[PDB]
Amino acid sequence: HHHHHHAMSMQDTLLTLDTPAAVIDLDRMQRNIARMQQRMDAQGVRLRPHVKTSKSVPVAAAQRAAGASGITVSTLKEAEQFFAAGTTDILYAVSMAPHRLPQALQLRRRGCDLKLIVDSVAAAQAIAAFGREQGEAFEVWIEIDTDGHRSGVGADDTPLLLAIGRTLHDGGMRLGGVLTHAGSSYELDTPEALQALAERERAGCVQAAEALRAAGLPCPVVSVGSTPTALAASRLDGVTEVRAGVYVFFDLVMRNIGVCAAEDVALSVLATVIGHQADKGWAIVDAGWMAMSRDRGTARQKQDFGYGQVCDLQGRVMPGFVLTGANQEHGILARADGAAEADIATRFPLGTRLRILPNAACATGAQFPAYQALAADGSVQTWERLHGW
Amino acid sequence: QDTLLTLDTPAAVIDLDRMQRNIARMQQRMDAQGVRLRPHVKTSKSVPVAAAQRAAGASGITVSTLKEAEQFFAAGTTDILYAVSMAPHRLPQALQLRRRGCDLKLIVDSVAAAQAIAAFGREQGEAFEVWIEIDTDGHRSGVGADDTPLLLAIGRTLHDGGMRLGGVLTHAGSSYELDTPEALQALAERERAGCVQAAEALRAAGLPCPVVSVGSTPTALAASRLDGVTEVRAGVYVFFDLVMRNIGVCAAEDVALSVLATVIGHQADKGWAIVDAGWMAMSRDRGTARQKQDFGYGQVCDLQGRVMPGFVLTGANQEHGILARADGAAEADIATRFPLGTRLRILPNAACATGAQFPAYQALAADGSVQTWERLHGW
Numbered sequence: 001h002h003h004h005h006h007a008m009s010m011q012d013t014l015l016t017l018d019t020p021a022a023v024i025d026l027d028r029m030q031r032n033i034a035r036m037q038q039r040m041d042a043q044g045v046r047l048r049p050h051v052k053t054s055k056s057v058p059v060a061a062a063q064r065a066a067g068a069s070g071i072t073v074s075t076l077k078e079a080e081q082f083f084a085a086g087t088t089d090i091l092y093a094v095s096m097a098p099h100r101l102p103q104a105l106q107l108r109r110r111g112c113d114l115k116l117i118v119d120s121v122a123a124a125q126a127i128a129a130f131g132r133e134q135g136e137a138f139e140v141w142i143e144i145d146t147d148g149h150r151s152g153v154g155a156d157d158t159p160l161l162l163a164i165g166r167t168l169h170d171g172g173m174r175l176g177g178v179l180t181h182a183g184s185s186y187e188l189d190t191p192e193a194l195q196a197l198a199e200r201e202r203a204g205c206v207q208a209a210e211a212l213r214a215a216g217l218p219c220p221v222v223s224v225g226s227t228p229t230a231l232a233a234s235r236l237d238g239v240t241e242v243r244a245g246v247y248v249f250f251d252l253v254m255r256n257i258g259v260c261a262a263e264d265v266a267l268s269v270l271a272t273v274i275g276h277q278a279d280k281g282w283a284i285v286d287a288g289w290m291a292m293s294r295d296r297g298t299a300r301q302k303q304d305f306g307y308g309q310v311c312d313l314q315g316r317v318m319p320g321f322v323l324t325g326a327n328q329e330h331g332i333l334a335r336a337d338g339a340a341e342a343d344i345a346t347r348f349p350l351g352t353r354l355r356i357l358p359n360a361a362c363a364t365g366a367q368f369p370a371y372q373a374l375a376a377d378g379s380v381q382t383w384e385r386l387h388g389w
Numbered sequence: 390q391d392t393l394l395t396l397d398t399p400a401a402v403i404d405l406d407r408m409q410r411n412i413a414r415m416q417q418r419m420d421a422q423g424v425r426l427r428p429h430v431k432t433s434k435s436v437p438v439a440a441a442q443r444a445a446g447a448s449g450i451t452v453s454t455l456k457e458a459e460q461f462f463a464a465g466t467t468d469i470l471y472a473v474s475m476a477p478h479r480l481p482q483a484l485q486l487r488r489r490g491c492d493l494k495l496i497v498d499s500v501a502a503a504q505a506i507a508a509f510g511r512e513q514g515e516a517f518e519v520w521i522e523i524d525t526d527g528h529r530s531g532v533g534a535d536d537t538p539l540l541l542a543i544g545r546t547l548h549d550g551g552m553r554l555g556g557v558l559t560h561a562g563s564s565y566e567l568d569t570p571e572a573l574q575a576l577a578e579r580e581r582a583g584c585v586q587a588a589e590a591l592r593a594a595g596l597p598c599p600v601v602s603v604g605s606t607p608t609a610l611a612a613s614r615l616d617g618v619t620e621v622r623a624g625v626y627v628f629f630d631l632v633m634r635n636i637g638v639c640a641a642e643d644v645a646l647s648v649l650a651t652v653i654g655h656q657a658d659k660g661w662a663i664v665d666a667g668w669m670a671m672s673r674d675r676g677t678a679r680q681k682q683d684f685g686y687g688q689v690c691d692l693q694g695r696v697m698p699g700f701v702l703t704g705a706n707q708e709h710g711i712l713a714r715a716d717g718a719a720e721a722d723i724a725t726r727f728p729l730g731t732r733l734r735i736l737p738n739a740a741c742a743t744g745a746q747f748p749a750y751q752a753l754a755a756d757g758s759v760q761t762w763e764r765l766h767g768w
């Protein structure tokens with residue numbers, strides 16, 4: 001009975017945690033993980049979750065347990081951490097910098113099946129020359145620009161695709177596939193527009209693969225995805241896998257895009273009321289921008305939630321109250337409509353605990369060394385996440 | 390030897406010569422005004438940075454969380470002010486720090502918070518030192534500077550309750566919306582006057598008020614006189630940033646923190662170079678968007694730290710920054726100018742926000758070598 005009694009006495013709840021804290025509602029997180037995996041299963045495509053949203057081993061474990069194939073990472077620090085934790089199938093989906101090639105080699109030499117990406121002849125030449133010198137056939141995929149968002153070779157630029165694909169293949173590297181990310185989906189907010197963009201993302205990445213194969217080059221993987229297009233695509237013909245990451249928790253930007261509801265948002269920041277300015281209808285809380293992040297993605301969408309939507313301790317939205325302003329360690333809670341709440345101190349007494357839903361789950365999560373994973377019984381567990389590079 | 394060529398990117402670099410000029414400039418100004426400097430370490434949360442501020446003549450520190458108080462106390466600093474309205478639930482943590490020998494000061498601006506402190510202090514045998522926060526410009530927390538009944542009620546709660554009423558403090562954070570010397574000077578005066586008014590009102594009621602503490606970096610640098618003030622608190626000046634440059638209290642050349650980044654590709658048609666410093670390196674802070682010159686996600690400099698006016702990060706995703714012309718034109722042959730692998734340094738909008746994105750700084754010495762200086766993350 002010794003381990004039992006001591007663990008009981010040490011176990012935290014939302015009442016005993018210090019604030020601010022990043023809380024994962026595990027039941028909502030599981031519903032999000034199931035929804036995404038079922039959709040991809042229905043599409044006959046693999047899901048390669050992007051772990052940059054959580055950078056947390058237990059979160060990724062839940063995604064793998066539900067049926068995910070491999071992971072996408074946004075840094076080699078993430079590749080190192082998840083490989084040490086037993087994940088071998090890892091796509092580093094940021095244009096490869098030559099100077100990181102020794103670290104990518106060492107990961108592959110230790111047993112990580114690490115894939116790199118490029119979008120230029122010079123980056124393909126760098127990888128191929130280093131692979132030849134070191135006796136390593138790196139696997140490299142070619143990044144495609146399908147919507148004008150950010151990096152990538154134009155889907156209709158056959159001459160640059162062929163030049164890159166030949167540099168890799170002739171150079172003795174394994175040209176493993178093409179990938180694209182239609183991040184312009186963040187600017188949309190109707191199901192029509194999202195469905196059309198998901199079709200353009202699919203069409204364009206398949207087009208780039210078909211041009212490489214028509215030149216005799218291998219291109220066995222075709223990888224697409226953002227959360228909104230993964231949820232909106234009607235068809236995924238020619239795609240082998242979809243990458244999505246922010247869905248694991250969702251957030252108010254996703255809610256405004258329309259691919260979830262506020263009640264699907266699994267990450268919230270637990271905060272305490274530390275003061276008021278009664279005549280302005282303000283409550284002051286200890287979640288400022290250092291807890292929420294400076295992300296204000298909702299400011300240009302159909303509903304601006306300031307630095308976040310206020311929920312009660314049970315996680316239920318309290319409509320009309322948001323964090324209207326934030327300094328480093330102080331957040332300013334007030335009415336979204338700009339009215340001065342009368343009696344704000346009785347509506348939100350000193351020491352009251354609240355939960356704030358984030359604009360951007362990827363940005364808020366990065367502010368914390370760890371999440372507190374909240375089980376149905378009200379107990380929490382600390383789930384570390386990675387910071388830095 | 391680690392240097393700017395050997396570091397992985399992105400990396401948060403402190404130019405030590407620049408930092409030391411900023412340290413000397415602030416201390417020299419506080420000395421000229423006859424007041425103590427109590428630096429706000431929330432900007433760096435790094436033991437060696439605060440050590441350099443103390444070596445130049447700083448008296449004590451200000452912290453924004455009790456985690457920073459734990460860190461700095463474990464490093465030997467005992468005169469610590471936790472300048473965020475005290476939450477009663479953190480009283481056991483504050484008590485344990487005091488009993489351990491940290492001369493930890495708390496602040497409040499309500500009768501209820503003062504009552505919670507004093508009742509806990511009496512129960513536990515601890516005369517907590519508490520200062521009353523004064524609102525001198527409508528920015529954030531604090532007792533209205535003309536709100537005497539509230540001020541006295543709080544002061545009597547503390548002092549009659551057996552606690553040590555140690556002082557008043559204010560932070561005129563609205564200084565951040567100004568961008569002229571006259572407006573900064575007038576705000577610095579309003580800040581000084583209202584904090585002094587509150588001290589005099591406590592003293593006139595027979596209550597102790599030995600400390601009068603004001604400050605933000607812009608008001609600390611703009612104040613023409615500080616009669617009646619015992620100390621100034623400032624933090625972001627240790628590195629400066631582009632928000633400060635636009636407020637007008639420094640030049641871009643004075644900014645001591647930059648983010649070293651590598652060019653990892655281009656979009657030739659748009660004249661973009663893509664770098665590996667996205668918003669996870671720079672933070673999402675866009676404080677310059679509301680100022681007279683918008684710097685996007687940061688001002689580009691070359692690897693030597695020379696500012697390159699006209700190139701900024703016009704956009705940023707999590708791990709990708711988009712460098713492009715500030716004038717919105719598509720730089721012709723951007724890849725010929727910034728080939729793959731080229732390293733650049735990006736000045737931040739807000740040094741406090743950018744620095745929090747990194748587990749550590751790289752302290753760059755005169756010979757080009759760097760030393761890693763860890764900093765704190767979380768609570």
Ligand SMILES: Cc1ncc(COP(=O)(O)O)c(CN/C(=C/C(=O)O)C(=O)O)c1O
Nearest residue numbers: 050093181225226227243244245246706707
């Ligand atoms: C290359 C790549 N693949 C997949 C994702 C996942 O998309 P979601 O975040 O799940 O929509 C990403 C994410 N990129 C990204 C998105 C954003 O907030 O705009 C970012 O910030 O980099 C990705 O890059």
Ligand SMILES: Cc1ncc(COP(=O)(O)O)c(CN/C(=C/C(=O)O)C(=O)O)c1O
Nearest residue numbers: 327328329429472560605606622623624625
């Ligand atoms: C209570 C208090 N005292 C001093 C400072 C230091 O001011 P600088 O950051 O050096 O100008 C602060 C800082 N507060 C702050 C300022 C900002 O608006 O960027 C913040 O975010 O909280 C402070 O709070």
Ligand SMILES: [Mg+2]
Nearest residue numbers: 246360362707
């Ligand atoms: Mg994102």
Ligand SMILES: [Mg+2]
Nearest residue numbers: 328625739741
């Ligand atoms: Mg600041």
